[PDB]
Design a protein around this ligand. Sequence first.
Ligand SMILES: [Zn+2]
Lengths: 49, 48, 86, 812
Amino acid sequence: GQALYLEAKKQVPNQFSSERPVGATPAMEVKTPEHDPGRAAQGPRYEWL
Amino acid sequence: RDIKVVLDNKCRAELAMKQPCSCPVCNLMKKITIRDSFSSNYAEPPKI
Amino acid sequence: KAEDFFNIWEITDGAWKIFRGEIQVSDKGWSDEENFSKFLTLLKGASVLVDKISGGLCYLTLDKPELALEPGDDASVLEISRPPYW
Amino acid sequence: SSAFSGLKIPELSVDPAEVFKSDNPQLVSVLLDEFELQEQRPFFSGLIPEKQINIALKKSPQLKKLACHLLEAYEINGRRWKHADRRRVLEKAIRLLEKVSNELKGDIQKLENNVKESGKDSEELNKTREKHGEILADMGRAYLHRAKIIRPKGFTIPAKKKESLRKALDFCKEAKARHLAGLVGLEMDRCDMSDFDSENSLEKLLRDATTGVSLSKDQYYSNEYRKAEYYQMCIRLAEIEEDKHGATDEGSENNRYKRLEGILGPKKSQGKKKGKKNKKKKGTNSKSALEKIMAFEKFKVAVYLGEGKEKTHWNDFSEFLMRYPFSHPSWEDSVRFLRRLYKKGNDKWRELSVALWEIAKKNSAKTSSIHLRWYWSRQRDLYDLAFLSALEQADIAEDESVRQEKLRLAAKVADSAKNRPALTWQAMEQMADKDEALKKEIENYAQALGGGYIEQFEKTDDIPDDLKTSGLVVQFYLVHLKDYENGYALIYDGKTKKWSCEMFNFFPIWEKYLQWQSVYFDLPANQKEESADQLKALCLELGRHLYFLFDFEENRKAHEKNQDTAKENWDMLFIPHDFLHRVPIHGAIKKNGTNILLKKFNCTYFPTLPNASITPESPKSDNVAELIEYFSEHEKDYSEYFDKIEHIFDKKNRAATSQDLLDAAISPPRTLTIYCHGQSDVNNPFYSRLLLKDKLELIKLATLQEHYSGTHIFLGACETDLMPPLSAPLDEQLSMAAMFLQKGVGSVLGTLWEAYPRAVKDIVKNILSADDTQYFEKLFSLKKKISVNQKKSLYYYLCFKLYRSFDQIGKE
RNA sequence: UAUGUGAUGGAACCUCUCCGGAUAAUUCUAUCUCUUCUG
Ligand SMILES: [Zn+2]
């Protein structure tokens, strides 16, 4: 199937639409802390399944 | 998304920031664990 | 509407599930029986409470404590394996 | 036209039939399948068969001609079009060029295998490769043009611009283009992105683009624009060579700019033959686009090398800055130029920063009456540079009067940006639904993105005078310049009238506040009092870093303690800035840990520096109180608890709506008690709303047209839950009390964090039991409930903030 | 195949937009086939 689809897109033009790519761009950000986060005193005490 | 609709928030999580976002949306999902799931009774190919 | 995306890899095969490792304790750490027993108790409790490791859900089983290559870091590129009979 | 003459207009891709009048079927097919047909009814026509000369069996030349025509039209008449037309034209050209490039690349790929067996046949294959390179260069041009006008949504640079610039750079490098690569590098540099490595150095790109370049008779440099980018490239190259510190030569540092000016200056124009100077009636000296856009470059080079004056370029530079909006890249270029001068150390920054700040204020004042300034990418830098220049020229002065006037100027500079918050692009784009003028301004700013020489723009109460009081005024200010982080606090002594300056560090205070905020937000709603230890640590750090406040008690003792009459004017005014709006400044603890600032000094805050010379009139209605209270069915406990107030004279209005608040505003009572919950919004501070029967928000209250008169307002909505959590020290937001003070109210009392009911009801009872003149006495009598031994008392009784006005403070 | 007094990556919905539509009476009369031998 995929092979025949490729042959069609190749040999048979005007059979399909293609302004498909818009508003995407991949993004991957990371940043290390600059200040000490500190310490807390509230922790878990229950669990639900 | 459902919990944000319920609590009426507009959080985006802004990917990586200087400090953790806090706020209830990011304070409740930080303590929720969800298992992945699979189709228990269906394995046939789908329709077009 | 979507704003951003990235790429992931997932392994769901049954064979590649169980992972095994070990912890090494030197002679100085084993100062006496009491300290080793307390360390084992704390380690067992912590191992019990572990829930998620490496993007998945798992549980840890701890056994009894009793005992006595190159990555080709040069320039190289290889991808797009496709499949057989292509 | 010497063209196809089928398209109705370049900016609207439509064809009004008439395509079939031509004979080439390929042209008709291309014009039909890739353009809008226009008209309102279907069109059914065809050509005649049996046509010779074949059909040429391809579409690549026609598509290339369409792409070239579209790019030429965009280059020529791109200024007059609107944003949507530019986007549409650029997208269509990119699509056509991409299709042509894909077809050519596929053809080359298939031909490569066949020519491999031809014994290394150098033939039209080379011409196909050259055509592919030309198409790649055109694609790079189109991508750069599209990226130059991307709308900057959000605080940071959008990713779309980054990917577009990367694609343009890749295409230009693969196409072996030097001028386009230099342009892409220049655009990348101004975006502050640093994805390039040492191999892809900006210096090498500029050198390649500028190596062996002369005016000559080259067609590419015939137009003035390309000369302009050549001049910009040369200027940036000289700047980077000087900044490398490897070219620190006494003679060459001026020789490079001298030859740059010689290139800029008249290159010995020969051949005019002295054409009689035929008295062209002084035709207004019509400045060409070349000088119109190179005024900035001329000013820069004159500053760099000019031993004499340079005011001629300053004259038209000032008007160019005044006419054009803040989205023009010239503003960022000027700010970066000022920063570079300040780092180098030439007084031009000192004499220019104040002028640029004044021009920026004048341009920003022409906005709507809503008092918004919009988010300019580099705006805090200009204000910080102006403040630092004022301080530096104050320090070097040898006259006391000059010192005082420069300190007053610095105080005015700090004051200028303390009330109007910037609201990004998308936020006010959404907010601009109601106002058409705001929509017009947004459209103008969007059109101003990219390039210059726009015909639309061309064809067109004393603040520091005298503070009359016997108290002390503190004007905090924080400098957020990257390499010169510091803090400042201007103190104005009423007795002496002289201003003072000093410096302090705020990073430990920021860290302590961050820890307290995290521990407070992570706690449950009913257990918010557990943050007492973190609050005490924050207060102790504040006292440690602000010890200089306690110094004035020695001067007070020297002044009136020796005098027979003690208890002089000990009032204190605080003007918080940036993140200092959410910390207990009055809760500072002395270094030894035994003295509290609130114990000795009566501290009150104010949103800005007061300058109004009118005292609010006495209330028209002498009603005692106007309690307004709403709650959900869950929290009936608060409604049950509040009964001591309803015993007192009140026409209780439970489950009241915003219209009740407006009606109360119509007839202002002596005291108003607005007690309700609140919710915060991150997109707009103007969307911060109160949890009444309806939603109040800030935009509704901003325009009311009815002013209070001497109404003491008590707000039950805490600041922490009315505002979003704070990340990074940079903050620009408005508070409910700040907007209430614009309505002629007397004073506003608020709570910084949740105050549980016993304390708020006791405070309400005490303030209602107070009389008219001595109301502030019982208001300030809460000091007896604050002690350092018990942290709970500090948590409970340090959350009260009073917005007392200057014109009424210290008045007896 | 880590390197150890410091990992919210369970810290992110492949989302959004688009009539399997258009045109056609389950109807009906002219031949078919090439080599015959002097006639
Ligand atoms: Zn959040």
